[PDB]
UniProtKB/Swiss-Prot annotation, chain A:
Motif (9aaTAD) on chain: 250-258
Name of the protein described by the UniProt record: Peroxisome proliferator-activated receptor gamma
Location(s) in or outside the cell: Nucleus; Cytoplasm
Location of this fragment in the whole protein: 235 to 504 of 505
Protein's GO biological process: BMP signaling pathway; cell differentiation; cell fate commitment; cell maturation; cellular response to hypoxia; cellular response to insulin stimulus; cellular response to low-density lipoprotein particle stimulus; epithelial cell differentiation
Gene this chain is encoded by: PPARG
Ranges of residues in domain NR LBD: 6-258
Cellular component per GO, a single term: receptor complex
Disease connection: Defects in PPARG can lead to type 2 insulin-resistant diabetes and hyptertension. PPARG mutations may be associated with colon cancer.
Quaternary context: Interacts with FOXO1 (acetylated form). Heterodimer with other nuclear receptors, such as RXRA. The heterodimer with the retinoic acid receptor RXRA is called adipocyte-specific transcription factor ARF6. Interacts with NCOA6 coactivator, leading to a strong increase in transcription of target genes. Interacts with coactivator PPARBP, leading to a mild increase in transcription of target genes. Interacts with NOCA7 in a ligand-inducible manner. Interacts with NCOA1 and NCOA2 LXXLL motifs. Interacts with ASXL1, ASXL2, DNTTIP2, FAM120B, MAP2K1/MEK1, NR0B2, PDPK1, PRDM16, PRMT2 and TGFB1I1.
Upregulation: (Microbial infection) Expression increases when incubated with M.tuberculosis or its lipoprotein LpqH; induction is TLR2-dependent (at protein level).
Written domain comment of the UniProt record: The 9aaTAD motif is a transactivation domain present in a large number of yeast and animal transcription factors.
């Protein structure tokens, strides 16, 4: 369908655009998380007092929640800019562009959040901070149990040991899903996705030649993504009905209309 | 090792034919009008069909309940067919016995949905090994939540059948589903993923040889595992509403026990 050199060219194009779109790459995140580096060392928030100190240096459960919301809105912006660089995307019907982004952003946010995580916590404020998993999970009300499922996913996803060049193509595959509800013209979407899938396949064989059927294992993760986004939506709805005082950025609000 | 992957595909195809009563190939010949099946399209024809053909399930006198229970009864039969097929998958019987049970327990729903599509088109479903055809409009027009319980199955089947898999494809796909290393409570995940890797390799080659013009069909088929997980989840929630709502669902406790897995 497509030839090797063109598939490599498409992989390079997507990697380059992923670097331009997203300020904190997996490579930077891992350097910070593993360290042995004096200049990139994060301030660690593990309890109430350190949270207070962290805000000098850089209700609690609400404030943290709103922090997640703020970064997710920024992430939607970053993902939207990346999507525009995917060959063919901006040429699609405009309603279909909206639909693809609407249903894809959440799955991509979860994917890319994993890059910022290990089993003990998450990088924040462009890598300047690290908030512990124990602290997040111990938050009160339903807020604790709202944070933990993200770590549970990230630990499993990070076991695949993808790098940024891999993720660039994977994220593109997610966006160009022809099975989203209400798509008007499925065919041109599937045509682009076939190219991306071919590109992802070759990328993974060259970049992880010892890792048998990594292509398939990675596509199987799209299943974990769909499920957790569904749980997420239902958890958020219970939170809104309990906490009629906090609200959501209009953009996220619109994304959640009809889930 | 191509030859070994072909050997594995043939082994699975042969066993899938022995295990399952009606193949996709036979079902499609019946569905496309290629000894017509008895057609159930309303209440009167249902009555005649069970009087003359004797569709097993029949014994609540209320039709919508009886059809619903019929789905459950056939699904229980399917569990035993799937269990027998699983034993023919190389490596499966050597797994820890608790893990065999776990894999089957959490896989059977996804497999039943998959294989149900083989028996469906946009207009209805074959029953009793293809001796009967019950229309989609009849099923969907059943009252209360029963109609809306039937329709999602057709909605899935129509999309899945667009891939135009044949039995030799499906034999490997079903095996891939069974050998899922992410099932809850698995004790020894490694040998499960090892077998699945072999099956995935076998499925990949099968699809390239059998459908060489069908680009990235391997990937499209794995993406259907997403539709499968989602609809099984919906299914569970639909079942739960029915149990809490319906007072006339009662069967002999022993029948109830037999079906506990699917209610
Ligand atoms: O820097 C980033 O790239 C980033 C991305 C996501 C979160 C984050 N979102 N979130 C959500 O619950 C969430 C998600 Cl996954 C998707 C869409 C919308 C939301 C929303 F928050 F609106 F509801 C999280 C839940 C838990 C955790 Cl640990 C993180 C997220 C992100 O987090 C920012 C940090 C988290 C700790 C407190 C300071 O902000 C960053
Ligand atoms: O011959 C077969 O291979 C076969 C397989 C499945 C059904 C059937 N199950 N079902 C379910 O709701 C279902 C499913 Cl999809 C998966 C797991 C468990 C269940 C359960 F029934 F337990 F709850 C159906 C729903 C609708 C329809 Cl149209 C069919 C199924 C099957 O059905 C046999 C027919 C259905 C109509 C009445 C006579 O039996 C056959």
């Amino acid at each position: 369908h497509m030839e090797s050199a063109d598939l490599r060219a498409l992989a390079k194009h997507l990697y380059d655009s992923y670097i331009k779109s997203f300020p904190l790459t997996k490579a930077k995140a891992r350097a910070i998380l593993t360290g042995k580096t004096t200049d990139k060392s994060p301030f660690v928030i593990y309890d109430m007092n350190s949270l207070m100190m962290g805000e000098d240096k850089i209700e609690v459960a609400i404030r943290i929640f709103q922090g997640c919301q703020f970064r997710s809105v920024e992430a939607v912006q970053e993902i939207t800019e990346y999507a525009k660089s995917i060959p063919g995307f901006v040429n699609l019907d405009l309603n279909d562009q909206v639909t693809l982004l609407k249903y894809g952003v959440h799955e991509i946010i979860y994917t890319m959040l994993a890059s910022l995580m290990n089993k003990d916590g998450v990088l924040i404020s462009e890598g300047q901070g690290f908030m512990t998993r124990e602290f997040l999970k111990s938050l009160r009300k339903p807020f604790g149990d709202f944070m933990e499922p993200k770590f549970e996913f990230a630990v499993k996803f990070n076991a695949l040991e993808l790098d940024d060049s891999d993720l660039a193509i994977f994220i593109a595959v997610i966006i160009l899903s022809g099975d989203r509800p209400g798509l008007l013209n499925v065919k041109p979407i599937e045509d682009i996705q076939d190219n991306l899938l071919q590109a992802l396949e070759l990328q993974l064989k060259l970049n992880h030649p010892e890792s048998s059927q990594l292509f398939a294992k990675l596509l199987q993760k799209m299943t974990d993504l769909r499920q957790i986004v569904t749980e997420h939506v239902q958890l958020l709805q219970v939170i809104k009905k309990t906490e009629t005082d906090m609200s959501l950025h209009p953009l996220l609000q619109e994304i959640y209309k009809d889930l």
